[PDB]
Design a protein around this ligand. Sequence first.
Ligand SMILES: O=C(O)c1cccc(/C=C/c2ccc(B(O)O)cc2)c1
Ligand SMILES: O=C(O)c1cccc(/C=C/c2ccc(B(O)O)cc2)c1
Lengths: 115, 116, 116, 115
Amino acid sequence: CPLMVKVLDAVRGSPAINVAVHVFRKAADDTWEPFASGKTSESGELHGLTTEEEFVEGIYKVEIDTKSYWKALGISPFHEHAEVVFTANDSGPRRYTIAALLSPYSYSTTAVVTN
Amino acid sequence: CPLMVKVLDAVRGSPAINVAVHVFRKAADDTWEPFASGKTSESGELHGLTTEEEFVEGIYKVEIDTKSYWKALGISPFHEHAEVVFTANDSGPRRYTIAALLSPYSYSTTAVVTNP
Amino acid sequence: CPLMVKVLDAVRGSPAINVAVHVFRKAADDTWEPFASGKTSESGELHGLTTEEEFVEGIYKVEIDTKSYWKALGISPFHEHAEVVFTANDSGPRRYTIAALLSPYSYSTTAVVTNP
Amino acid sequence: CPLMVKVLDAVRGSPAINVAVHVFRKAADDTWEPFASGKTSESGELHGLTTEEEFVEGIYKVEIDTKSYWKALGISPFHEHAEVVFTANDSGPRRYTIAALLSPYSYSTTAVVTN
Ligand SMILES: O=C(O)c1cccc(/C=C/c2ccc(B(O)O)cc2)c1
Ligand SMILES: O=C(O)c1cccc(/C=C/c2ccc(B(O)O)cc2)c1
């Protein structure tokens, strides 16, 4: 599991469940090509997106469909989605956790990168 | 204005209005002595808490009454309040803005510290 | 000033100065058209990006160039930039402040939306 | 594990390891009495602080010694510590995760409360 995504709900104090997540890899012509996707689990986590062999160095975008999440709760949100854009860098044998903490008009994201 | 507090609401996308704020300073006997208090304005800002003369070196606690805020709005929040504890002015006088961003089960606080 | 961007530095406890900001608007063909750009001032604020007339209904992307900011400071950050994507003015004109708080491996963004 | 604490470092993108954490329970005279304490692990987590039998309803304070953490990294921080103060409420059979994300001049804390 080189790449894991975790989404939390700051309004209800819970995992953000059944949130759609799309990962893209930046192509040579600067466009975003689909790479992997899924929905967060009951624990707010999305595992199994990719493998060590497939996850090469490059620029990646993680798009979290926050708008649909809030609308399913009857809450009008600000953002269309949350986007996290980063470079994967091999300098070391490591795993990336992209975590996002969601509010209707705000979100915060951090990377936990470990060996 | 050596000490300012600003509070935002992450549910409403607005300033957090009418938030009570209590400031304490640690005394020589290690207890928290009341130092200043007030509430945020329509802009979510609290000015005029203290003066350059009275805001001496020390350890200060800024207590933001988030529970009263959310409850006054009919929401049941997780935290009792948000506490910001810091040493101030120990390299001479600085100006401090304490900012807080509130959600019912989460808050974040940052400080902007400038040299006048 | 219908659109303002403010950026703070959580490592330094200061405004984030000289941060480049690019704004895009989604076009009819679903591509991102350049809309406005600038950089944050000494106060960490970026004013004058647009006007009430030109800031029409649409989907906007505010790209904050956090990597260039941290690298200009000799730090190697995680993110390429911070992107804030939102529908604006679809219930009539509003004023938007987009705030971002930056660390090398983390950022948070909030919006304050007011009705003039 | 009714109560777990997790601490993350936003500067290095890692767990915050070997961070001292003290939990207090508010006593009838409004004073804070020591309840439980420990140091975060290699994963930034502190488990085993208390038990279901001991963790009754009441007001609790979790104090995270952020100052020592940053000083051990040669970074001058703003806060003396991070304090998280909350009421434990039985309305439901649940577990509390108190998470904190640390920067030198800022911190953010969220509660993830689950069954
Ligand atoms: O704490 C966070 O997570 C956070 C995140 C994103 C933005 C902010 C805003 C801070 C702020 C600081 C000072 C002023 B001011 O001097 O008027 C206004 C806003 C705070
Ligand atoms: O963004 C904020 O404001 C914020 C605030 C408080 C905590 C967090 C992080 C939560 C988290 C929990 C577990 C993992 B993990 O699977 O190692 C990672 C992150 C983020």
